[PDB]
Design a protein around this ligand. Structure first.
Ligand SMILES: Nc1nc2c(ncn2[C@@H]2O[C@H](COP(=O)(O)OP(=O)(O)OP(=O)(O)O)[C@@H](O)[C@H]2O)c(=O)[nH]1
Ligand SMILES: O=C([O-])C(=O)[O-]
Ligand SMILES: [Mn+2]
Ligand SMILES: [Mn+2]
Ligand SMILES: [Mn+2]
Length: 620
């Protein structure tokens, strides 16, 4: 079948067989092996023996360090330039720009970066040829969602980073059994490279292979391809997560009639023995993980975690909105995690966990801002910059977007239906973001269409999860601004169309704000475990309790309708204060944003809600 072989990479396979691969999978492996020119090919089997060799490899290359204080925990330190997502270098390629983003009326679009095929071809050909020279190409077969389940989606990620392989083993279901389930079926093509071919032209920082200058994360939904170059950080390199399960999947969901959202899924049980499931979309670094693992302070209440970041939802034959968590672990923000804020996370991350960019203690432990644990005398701290660090410096010991990567099955409060292929029934959806002023603690939408408008109007302070600085209040509708895989106007019409479904049991929609501050600049709400008091009110509202009061922005709890026992000091007046002056400016900014950014793709029912809210505020 060949004249000089040349295209047969069988001699370079150090684990597995190209013969054992399905036809379309081998073509994908061999085609990119010809282009990237790796020295070795490793077909992953997901075994414990393989994971051990990958760790020892990384440890011999100075990529990770063993945290001897815990059981099978490891620390990785990255280049300070490769620490988070880069929204400005995350592009979607479609034939028509209108399929990716609405055509803005004035400025440029904030709802996604579109790039033509012709432009991406030039960018691709300038990066990937020979990019894996001297390195191993790992072939990761992985499933998003329970293996063998009909709703699960399968991908193949090619990467030259063992750090990516080890993280994908935690965050997805990967190995030989996925190739057996895939067969000749369709799979999502994922290609990743750190962009540092050997021999090294440039010296690496902290032994972290990356190419910041050429970083590009590209999505080709028409070709079911994800192509990532230059970055090793999880959001850019774990292509099953944000790239697949949110950006690519949101477009497939639009085409197939389901939903892919940036949401946690939890189950909450009340003292009367009743349990309901809730989903919550908060922007990055705005509280999803802490809410989904919450230890409630109300007696008789129990929270269980289905997932903390991504939800795939679909109406069943009975009209229930059912959700699954397609992920296999948690990729959570480390700073702020303590026994008092998220004790269930502390119990989880003590074994089989990979930490990135946190501080190391001299006795083999971890440290970060907000850990709230004193160290023993003589224990010294090494910062994420691999330097000596004292508590009286200015640099934090851990990067603000440092992460743990831990298996979901180790969480003490993991929900017993978290791997159920039928999903869990959602009865409530929660929106919310970081708003230091104006936005009350919690309110309830007036209808399904008003609730969609509430999601579309979400604003929040910038965080360390992306490249945004200044804590400026940005728009982040549905917490999905960095993750839309298609036109945001069509996304809104997709959400609105669910109210047309026959026998659809539409959940209630709430909006919360844990982050409101007083005149002094400190938080008015204790949050974390105390957020169970807000969830209690939502639970009763779903049951139909008459505990709400009508306001121009929606329903708020009645007086003495929230359980505030054990606090008392809470300035309830400022937690639910609705200033006409604040909200007149808020609707103006929402109006200017929706008019410019969504333009002719803005559904009329969203504009009608904007006009209705503007009228109710003027009547105050
Ligand atoms: N004041 C206050 N801070 C909170 C609360 N919940 C979480 N935080 C802090 O906000 C930061 C982000 O919390 P996470 O739960 O990790 O945010 P996330 O939504 O899961 O973010 P991603 O994983 O990037 O999607 C953490 O450092 C927490 O300490 C809260 O209820 N009140
Ligand atoms: O990493 C995440 O979950 C993010 O950036 O939202
Ligand atoms: Mn997230
Ligand atoms: Mn999280
Ligand atoms: Mn309608």
């Amino acid at each position: 079948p060949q004249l000089h072989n040349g295209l047969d990479f069988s001699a370079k396979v150090i684990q597995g067989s190209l013969d054992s691969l399905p036809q379309e999978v081998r073509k994908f492996v061999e085609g990119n092996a010809q282009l990237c020119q790796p020295e070795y090919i490793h077909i992953c089997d997901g075994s414990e023996e393989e994971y051990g060799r990958l760790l020892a490899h990384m440890q011999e290359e100075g990529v990770i360090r063993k945290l001897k204080k815990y059981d099978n925990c490891w620390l990785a330190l990255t280049d300070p330039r490769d620490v988070a997502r880069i929204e400005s270098k995350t592009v979607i390629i479609t034939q028509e720009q209108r399929d990716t983003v609405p055509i803005p009326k004035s400025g440029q679009s904030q709802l996604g970066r579109w790039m033509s095929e012709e432009d991406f071809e030039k960018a691709f050909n300038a990066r990937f040829p020979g990019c894996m020279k001297g390195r191993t190409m790992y072939v990761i077969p992985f499933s998003m969602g329970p293996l063998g389940s009909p709703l699960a989606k399968i991908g193949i990620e090619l990467t030259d980073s063992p750090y990516v392989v080890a993280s994908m083993r935690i965050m997805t279901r990967m190995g030989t059994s996925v190739l057996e389930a895939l067969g000749d079926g369709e799979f999502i093509k994922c290609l990743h490279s750190v962009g540092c071919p050997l021999p090294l032209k440039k010296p690496l920082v902290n032994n972290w292979a990356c190419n910041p200058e050429l970083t590009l994360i590209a999505h080709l939904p028409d070709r079911r391809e994800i192509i990532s170059f230059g970055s090793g950080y999880g959001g850019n390199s774990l292509l099953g997560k944000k790239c697949f399960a949110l950006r690519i999947a949101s477009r497939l969901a639009k085409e197939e009639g389901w939903l892919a959202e940036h949401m946690l899924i939890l189950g909450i049980t009340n003292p009367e023995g009743k349990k309901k499931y809730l989903a919550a979309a908060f922007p990055s670094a705005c509280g999803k993980t802490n809410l989904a693992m919450m230890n409630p302070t109300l007696p008789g209440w129990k929270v269980e975690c289905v997932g903390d970041d991504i939800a795939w939802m679909k109406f069943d034959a009975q009209g229930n909105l059912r959700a699954i968590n397609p992920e296999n672990g948690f990729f959570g923000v480390a700073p702020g995690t303590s026994v008092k804020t998220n004790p269930n996370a502390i119990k989880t991350i003590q074994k089989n966990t990979i930490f990135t960019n946190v501080a190391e203690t001299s006795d083999g432990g971890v440290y970060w801002e907000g850990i709230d644990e004193p160290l023993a005398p003589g224990v010294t701290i090494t910062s994420w910059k691999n330097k000596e660090w004292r508590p009286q410096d200015e640099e934090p010991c851990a990067h603000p977007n440092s992460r743990f990567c831990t298996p979901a099955s180790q969480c003490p409060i993991i929900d017993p239906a978290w791997e159920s292929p039928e999903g869990v029934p959602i009865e409530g959806i929660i929106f919310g973001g970081r708003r230091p002023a104006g936005v009350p603690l919690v309110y309830e939408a007036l209808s399904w269409q008003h609730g969609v408008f509430v999601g579309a109007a979400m604003r929040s302070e910038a965080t360390a999860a992306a490249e945004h600085k200044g804590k400026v209040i940005m728009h982040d509708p549905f917490a999905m601004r960095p993750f839309f895989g298609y036109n945001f106007g069509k996304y809104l019409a997709h959400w609105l169309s669910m109210a047309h479904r026959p026998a659809a049991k539409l959940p209630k929609i709430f909006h919360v704000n844990w982050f409101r501050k007083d005149k002094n600049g400190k938080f008015l709400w204790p949050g974390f475990g105390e957020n169970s008091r807000v969830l209690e009110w939502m639970f009763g509202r779903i049951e139909g309790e008459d505990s709400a009061k009508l306001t121009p922005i929606g329903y708020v709890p009645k007086e003495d309708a929230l359980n505030l026992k054990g606090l008392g000091d809470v300035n309830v007046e400022e937690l639910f204060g609705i200033s006409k002056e604040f909200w007149e400016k808020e609707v103006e900014e929402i109006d200017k944003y929706l008019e410019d950014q969504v333009n002719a793709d803005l559904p009329y029912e969203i504009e009608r809600e904007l006009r209705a809210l503007k009228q109710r505020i003027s009547q105050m």
